[PDB]
From a paper:
The SaYbeY structure consists of a four-stranded β-sheet and five α-helices. The active site cleft was identified between the protruding α5 and α2 from the flat surface of α3. The bound Zn2+ was found at the active site near α4, which was confirmed by the anomalous signal from the diffraction dataset collected at the Zn absorption edge wavelength. Two citrate molecules (Cit1 and Cit2) were assigned to the electron density maps based on the matched molecular shapes and crystallization solution containing 0.1 M sodium citrate (pH 5.5). The binding of the Cit1 molecule is further stabilized by the ionic interaction with Arg58 from α-helix 2. The hexahistidine tag was in the α-helical conformation and the loop conformation in the C-terminal end of SaYbeY, thus occupying the putative substrate-binding space between α3 and α5. In the modeled structure, the single-stranded RNA was located in the active site cleft between α2 and α5, and a phosphate backbone connecting nucleotides 3 and 4 was located near Zn2+ at the active site of SaYbeY.
This enzyme is essential for the maturation and quality control of ribosomal RNA in a wide range of bacteria and for virulence in some pathogenic bacteria. Early studies revealed that [name] was involved in late-stage 70S ribosome quality control and the maturation of the 3' terminus of the 16S rRNA in bacteria. A later study revealed that Zn2+ is required for the nuclease activity of [name].
Author numbering: 1 to 71, 86 to 161
C-alpha cells in the first residue's frame, strides 16, 4: 500500500491533481522496488507560509519551491509552495499541476535518502529521477527540469 496525506492551505489544488500526484509517486515507489507499505504527507502552501516555514525550520528567511523533512514505513513530509510552482511551471513550459508533481517526486526521492549536494550523489539521484519520469511517459527534456 501507499498513502499520501494531502493538505492544501491555498485552495488552488484541484481534486484531479491530487490523483495525478499520488499516481506518479506510487509509480516511483514501485520503480524503487519498495515492497513495504509506505506513507507520507504533501502540503501545499503560499509564498508567505513557505517563507515562515523555511525561516523557523531551516533558518532560511526566504521563499522556496519545495522543502522535504525526512524521518508502514513513515517517510516524512514534503511542503510545496504554490506561488513558486506556478512561476516555475511557466518558465519550464508545462502546467502548474505538472510542476507540483515534479516537485513532489523530487521531495519523495529526498525522503528515500537520495541527495544531490555532491556531483556523485546528484548523478545517482537525477539518474533515478530521469529514469522514473521517462518510464512514466514524461520524456520531454524540460519535464526533467533540463536535468
Ligand atoms: Zn533537492
Amino acid at each position: 500500500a501507499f498513502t499520501i496525506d494531502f493538505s492544501d492551505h491555498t485552495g488552488l489544488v484541484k481534486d484531479a491533481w491530487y490523483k495525478q500526484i499520488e499516481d506518479l509517486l506510487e509509480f516511483a515507489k514501485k520503480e524503487e522496488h519498495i515492497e513495504d507499505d509506505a506513507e507520507l504527507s504533501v502540503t501545499f502552501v503560499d509564498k508567505q507560509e513557505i517563507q515562515e516555514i523555511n525561516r523557523t525550520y531551516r533558518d532560511k528567511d526566504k521563499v522556496t519551491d519545495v522543502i522535504s523533512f525526512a524521518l508502514p514505513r513513515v517517510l516524512g513530509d514534503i511542503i510545496i509552495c504554490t506561488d513558486v510552482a506556478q512561476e516555475q511551471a511557466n518558465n519550464y513550459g508545462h502546467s502548474f499541476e505538472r510542476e507540483l508533481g515534479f516537485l513532489a517526486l523530487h521531495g519523495f526521492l529526498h525522503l528515500l535518502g537520495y541527495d544531490h549536494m555532491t556531483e556523485a550523489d546528484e548523478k545517482e539521484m537525477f539518474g533515478r529521477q530521469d529514469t522514473i519520469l521517462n518510464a512514466y511517459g514524461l520524456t520531454r527534456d524540460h519535464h526533467h527540469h533540463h536535468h
